[PDB]
């Protein structure tokens, strides 16, 4: 593949999270500033965990969506059986859900975007979770810290998708493939942006996907969800 052929690469990819993206980076930079009050706090606290479950399943599934919307605008993945396209979304969308959570996460007040404001972890108590909570605030307060450009995000959750390693893949050689051409487009953007850096500061594969088995365990036990 030439030069121009893997520049089209990282074009297409960063154009196609740019539509899948749920909420623009600058509209979440800008309501930083809109933090929930300690009574709209004490009123997330006091609901029950049912009706807390009730909500950020939903608020999950929408999230999930964008994360399928934007797989299928990666034209090598549309190309793929739909045996090795639900193995790569089942295995890898709840791991992309929860790296593009970092960019509604701000370091400075360790708060969230969630539900029209930011607020603390102390909001998601009804849940009875706070191991799992800490872990995303953990997770994306780490990621924060590297200054996750769009462009980045976007090839690093093609990747996270493009997967040839997942077990259950029948044409595993035309996943590899695909997963060689993104590797390639993210070291030469990387490269073009003196980006080489954050390469070595991003998480071991392992470590995501031990991560997202927490999480698609806790769910198990409050619905039959997409990600079920
Ligand atoms: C803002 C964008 C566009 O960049 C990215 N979109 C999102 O943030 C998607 C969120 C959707 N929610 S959420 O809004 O209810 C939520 C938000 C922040 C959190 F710390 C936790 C939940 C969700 C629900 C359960 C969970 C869980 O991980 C949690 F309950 F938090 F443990 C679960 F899977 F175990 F249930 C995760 C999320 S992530």
Not at 4 to 10: F, G, M, S
Request: include cysteine; glycine fraction near 4%; charged fraction near 25%.
């Amino acid at each position: 593949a030439s030069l121009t052929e893997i520049e089209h690469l990282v074009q297409s990819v960063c154009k196609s999270y740019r539509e899948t993206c749920q909420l623009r980076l600058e509209d979440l930079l800008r309501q930083r500033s809109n933090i929930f009050s300690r009574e709209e706090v004490t009123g997330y606290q006091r609901k029950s965990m049912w009706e807390m479950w009730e909500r950020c399943a939903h608020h999950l599934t929408e999230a999930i969506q964008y994360v399928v919307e934007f797989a299928k605008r990666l034209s090598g993945f549309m190309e793929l059986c739909q045996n090795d396209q639900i193995v790569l979304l089942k295995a890898g969308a709840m791991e992309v859900v929860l790296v593009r959570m970092c960019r509604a996460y701000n370091a400075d007040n360790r708060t969230v975007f969630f539900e029209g404001k930011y607020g603390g972890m102390e909001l998601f108590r009804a849940l009875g979770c706070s191991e799992l909570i800490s872990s995303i605030f953990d997770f994306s307060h780490s990621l924060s810290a590297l200054h996750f450009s769009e462009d980045e995000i976007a090839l690093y959750t093609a990747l996270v998708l493009i997967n040839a390693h997942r077990p259950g893949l029948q044409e595993k050689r035309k996943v590899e493939q695909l997963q060689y051409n993104l590797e390639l487009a993210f070291h030469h953007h990387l490269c073009k942006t003196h980006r080489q850096s954050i390469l070595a500061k991003l998480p071991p594969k392992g470590k995501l996907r031990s991560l997202c088995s927490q999480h698609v365990e806790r769910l198990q036990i409050f619905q039959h969800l997409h990600p079920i």
